[PDB]
Amino acid sequence: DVALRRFKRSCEKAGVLAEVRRREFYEKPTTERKRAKASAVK
Amino acid sequence: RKQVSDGVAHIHASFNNTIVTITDRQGNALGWATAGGSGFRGSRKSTPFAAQVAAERCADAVKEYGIKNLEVMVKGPGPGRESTIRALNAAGFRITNITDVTPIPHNGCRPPKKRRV
Amino acid sequence: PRRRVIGQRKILPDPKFGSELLAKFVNILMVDGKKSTAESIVYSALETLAQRSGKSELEAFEVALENVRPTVEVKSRRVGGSTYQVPVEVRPVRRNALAMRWIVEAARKRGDKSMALRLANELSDAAENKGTAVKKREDVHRMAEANKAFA
RNA sequence: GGGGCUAUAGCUCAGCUGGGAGAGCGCCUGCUUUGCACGCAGGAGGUCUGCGGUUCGAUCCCGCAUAGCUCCACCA
RNA sequence: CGGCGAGUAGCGCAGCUUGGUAGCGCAACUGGUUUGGGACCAGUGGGUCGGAGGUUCGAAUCCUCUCUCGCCGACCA
RNA sequence: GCGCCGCCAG
RNA sequence: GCUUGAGUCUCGUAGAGGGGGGUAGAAUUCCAGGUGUAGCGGUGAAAUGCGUAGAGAUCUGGAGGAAUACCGGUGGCGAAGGCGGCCCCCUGGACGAAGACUGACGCUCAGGUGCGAAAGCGUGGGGAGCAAACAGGAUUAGAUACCCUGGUAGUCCACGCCGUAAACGAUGUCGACUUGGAGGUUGUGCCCUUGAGGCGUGGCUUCCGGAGCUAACGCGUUAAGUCGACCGCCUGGGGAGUACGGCCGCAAGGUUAAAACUCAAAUGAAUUGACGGGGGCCCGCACAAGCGGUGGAGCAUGUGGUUUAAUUCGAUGCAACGCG
RNA sequence: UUGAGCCUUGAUGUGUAGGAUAGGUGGGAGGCUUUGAAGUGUGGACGCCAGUCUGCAUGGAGCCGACCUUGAAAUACCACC
Ligand SMILES: [K+]
Ligand SMILES: [K+]
Ligand SMILES: [K+]
Ligand SMILES: [K+]
Ligand SMILES: [K+]
Ligand SMILES: [K+]
Ligand SMILES: [Mg+2]
Ligand SMILES: [Mg+2]
Ligand SMILES: [Mg+2]
Ligand SMILES: [Mg+2]
Ligand SMILES: [Mg+2]
Ligand SMILES: [Mg+2]
Ligand SMILES: [Mg+2]
Ligand SMILES: [Mg+2]
Ligand SMILES: [Mg+2]
Ligand SMILES: [Mg+2]
Ligand SMILES: [Mg+2]
Ligand SMILES: [Mg+2]
Ligand SMILES: [Mg+2]
Ligand SMILES: [Mg+2]
Ligand SMILES: [Mg+2]
Ligand SMILES: [Mg+2]
Ligand SMILES: [Mg+2]
8 A cells, every 4th residue: 555656647547537527618728728827027 | 366466556545534545556446444334423533543443354354365565556645545545454454555646636626516515 | 912922820739638730720719709609619529529429539529520521522714704613622731721621511510509519510420421511521532533534 | 885905213114923113314523634525433313093912013913093095986 | 236255373374064172384482502683403381262142051163144355146137 | 715885964 | 334232033941821622639519328216407505497208427339510729929911901720733932042034114092892700780691609689597776787598590511781890000112311129920051060059141020228218108120200292180079970962782870071059178198196896014902712791681870852030051873872 | 037916844933030042822841762872073054153054974873851040941853933
């Protein structure tokens, strides 16, 4: 019972279930994809 | 009763509830328990403890079948993906495999609308 | 408190027996700073408890405490705008603090003659269970067992 | 009519069991919370009416008494 | 003209059948909560039952007459 | 989980 | 005449550019069975709903529609709108490389014409999932909402119509010129290519920033800098992108577009505060942990009110009410 | 396959006392009895795990009775359920 199933983190299984719970309107993903990578900055 | 010494525990871990169904390898159910049916309701129902207790109550009610080795199969994001597998091991089964079978569409059907809470 | 998180201080031992545990018990029982009145009640009640159940004076007292001391109790956390009654392990100092408070609280509710009798009976009750203080403990445990989900 | 059936906390409903009155919602405290709900833990609250049968029968043989229940109804 | 129904607290309504004891919601009142109002909480209070007569030991309740207000009918010519 | 409002001029 | 603008040809390159057809895997739903048994589902909590007529769970088989996880990227392509599995067919543009060719053939563009997200409309299909309307359940003072359970248009396809969006870079098109830095992407040349090197040269693109500009914010070789060509448009707020008329449209409406009347403002950017059911960090008997009270009783005392000939005047959230 | 009846032959019964998981009674003094027993190995059987019921083996002729404890007393066999 070591239960190191961090493969689920690797496959982003829980990630993909959370994002699929509700519909994101195309506009909303675009805005967060732009805000994600503006934040990805030194 | 039946000669089932090695089955599979199917864990349906939703956000609201956990259903544990033990089955033979062919997929015929032997017994089941739920967090909802184990004297846990509402806020308590959606906890890793209520799932543990359910997995305990499901280990019991397949005593007669005489199972020893089980593969685990975990659907869903919910609390009690892991407290359920621990409980199965602690109930004296030999955990063999742990697959995850949460279905992901490869795009597919439009989900319901976002909640405005 | 927010900043300096210090409390409590030195106490004298019980005059008769030399027990800080028993000296605290007097303080729980005391009212209006009448410590002479309180320690008279305790000694009377212990004397009766000693001859009634056998044992020593403090040995009889500790046995009562053993059966009222709570192991866990519910708190309140507030995680995300939602109050969960989380069970938490009560520390040894608070353990016997609640024990002593519940015994005294029970004894003051009983309808006997003197406080010394009221107390003596409640100490005897606690040592055998069936009392109001042990019901408090049991109730506190049931509360904590019901909310074992929230740990 | 003649039969067969259920008739238990204030409401609700199980109690195959001849070894016994149980759950949830009301109502009473306590914890709970900024209060308010929500949730949680205790606490009371009596089993148609009579016999037979006895080793005890909310629980059964028998006979009455109740509303409910269907069948006969050229009930002349 | 004939028929049916109604009249109960400020308002809207149970109760009447089957005589003994008048309820319910809102409003009103006092207190609490608020900086204050609303909401909310806790406490109260307020009717002799349209009028009159009768039966009854006793009538909101049963009987009769009456007033007021509704509703229905008034067809064949 | 629930959180409405604040008379006119100055 | 000329070749430097513009164009043609040759060879390659990258690309969710477009149209048509096909196909794959995952998942949802439904249907038929097997196993199995009392719950499922849902929420803040519930309930409506589903379930012993056997649900949910689990396994098998089948049907059908829609969308293509990962790759995936301030990545790419397109005039804009937009375009994302894989395969084929038809097809548009862009860029590079040297070289040949034509010889100003250019730029802009009122009117005009075409394309033009979503919703919507017409006819005919289709319909899994989602979901205006609608229904029920909650919540609430109410709740025609937000939340829940359902759910019809529609979303999908064909053909037609509509012609609008914060259709945005709120920035018209074309050309020239003017310090830099770090990237992305896509070509190409040269050099020990001597290993996911080094030095050049093109195209497109992200971020930073210099001069300059700007009300400021900011923009900054992809300019909002410095100039030139042409077009579109503005002239205080409201009334109003409304009415009337015209044109367009099946309709919804679009488009063009006033006036009276009314106000002394309306407005942009930035500043200091204050505020937030914004974020971070702290504190105080603020809370928590405790102990004892007040609110009930009688009485004392102050106040409100009422009363009175007069009950003198003042103090009135906290910070008036055993107060002057 | 699957019930329903019936026949025949097996198994089955948890007040509290407690040899102790007791349906009513007698022809009622023993029989299943080397178509073999004491004691043990195994399996089936249910469970309120106290325990009982026995098949197959082994060991190879002994377990057993009615007493005393209980509402209810033999289940020492058998017979009517
Ligand atoms: K006629
Ligand atoms: K192409
Ligand atoms: K839906
Ligand atoms: K539909
Ligand atoms: K400035
Ligand atoms: K004007
Ligand atoms: Mg034009
Ligand atoms: Mg459309
Ligand atoms: Mg259409
Ligand atoms: Mg259509
Ligand atoms: Mg909805
Ligand atoms: Mg426009
Ligand atoms: Mg756009
Ligand atoms: Mg514009
Ligand atoms: Mg042009
Ligand atoms: Mg810049
Ligand atoms: Mg118009
Ligand atoms: Mg017009
Ligand atoms: Mg406090
Ligand atoms: Mg007082
Ligand atoms: Mg005064
Ligand atoms: Mg003044
Ligand atoms: Mg003041």
